[PDB]
Symmetry: D2
């Protein structure tokens, strides 16, 4: 599994469950094409987005729909969403985990990149 | 000054200086229109982006060119940039930068 | 002012006001001795902890009473406090607070 | 496994491997007693610190030896270590993951607490 997303909730100390995630890939003509989407599980994880074959070199945008998450919990947050934009697989294939930690007026994002 | 940006470097424990910042406002047709831009100062701060008059309610995007910042230091970064997207309904957008990670917070006072 | 502390609230997007901060210096016998203390201001800042004269090289501990802060808001927090331990060899110790998480950074200029 | 520690490296985008972790428990007389210790694996994780039976109610300090980690990589970091101090199991037993994200002049810590 070459692209995984993990989301945690810094207010509740829990995984962030059922968070919508949209992934896009920058096309030849510089527009963002829909690549893959899904939502985080009970463990705050989203797997199965893509395959090794499909996940070619490119610039990818991972959009985490944080606003809808916080709104469902009764919190009016600051951000519309958390976007993570990165070049992937430009010196051959890697496995990426995009991790986000969410608070209503703040988020943090890191990537763990392995061979 | 209703909107300011502050950027810090988590590797060096310093302001992140001369970092390009571009701000956009969402247009009626769902396009991002150029609003304001600047480079962070010696103190890692960017002031004077806009005025209370022009900073009306709307959806805004603040894009921080983190890649160029790391590249000028000879450090390979993960992200293409750091984007902060919010509805304006004083705003300080702060970002703390590492090569493979960033945090962003809004202080609204 | 060689040492200042700044605390922000990540739930409200605001300075964290009236937060108790205690600073200690490590003694020769490996004990923590009381050095300086204060409460954060309306801007979430604590200045005037010490002087250049007294702020000599050594190991320092900055303890931020985050538990009391959340408790006064009716929010059950995870941590007892936030501790920052460093060797002093201007220092701004910043902390960004959530109920189950905090981040701390040092800006040294 | 009721107490786990996970450590990531924000400079390299990798788990933080072989990081020393010391856990203490506040004793009756207000001193910190050695509870458990170990070091993070190739995945940046430390498991097997304690058992359900031993991990009673109390105030625990988890000390992550970040300075030694950064020094081994040629970086002179700001902090001596990252300390996480918390009351555990005070409304019955829980499972705790203490997560840290490390940069030379900054760290972040969150806890994920489950039943
Ligand atoms: O599985 C993980 O890698 C994980 C990670 C975090 C976390 C903590 C701090 C941070 F800045 C980002 C994170 F994704 C919090 C909890 C967690 O379980
Ligand atoms: O001026 C400020 O508001 C400031 C802020 C930080 C900081 C710390 C942690 C974090 F997640 C984000 C930040 F921008 C670090 C240092 C700092 O001076």
């Amino acid at each position: 599994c070459p692209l995984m997303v993990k989301v945690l909730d810094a207010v509740r100390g829990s995984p962030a469950i059922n968070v919508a995630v949209h992934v896009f890939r920058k096309a030849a003509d510089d527009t963002w094409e829909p690549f893959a989407s899904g939502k985080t599980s009970e463990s705050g994880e989203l797997h199965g987005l893509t395959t090794e074959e499909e996940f070619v070199e490119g610039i990818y945008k991972v959009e985490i729909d944080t606003k809808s998450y916080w709104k469902a919990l009764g919190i009016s947050p600051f951000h519309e969403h958390a976007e993570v934009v990165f070049t992937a697989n430009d010196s051959g294939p890697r496995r990426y985990t995009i991790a986000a930690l969410l608070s209503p007026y703040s988020y943090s994002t890191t990537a763990v990149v392995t061979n």
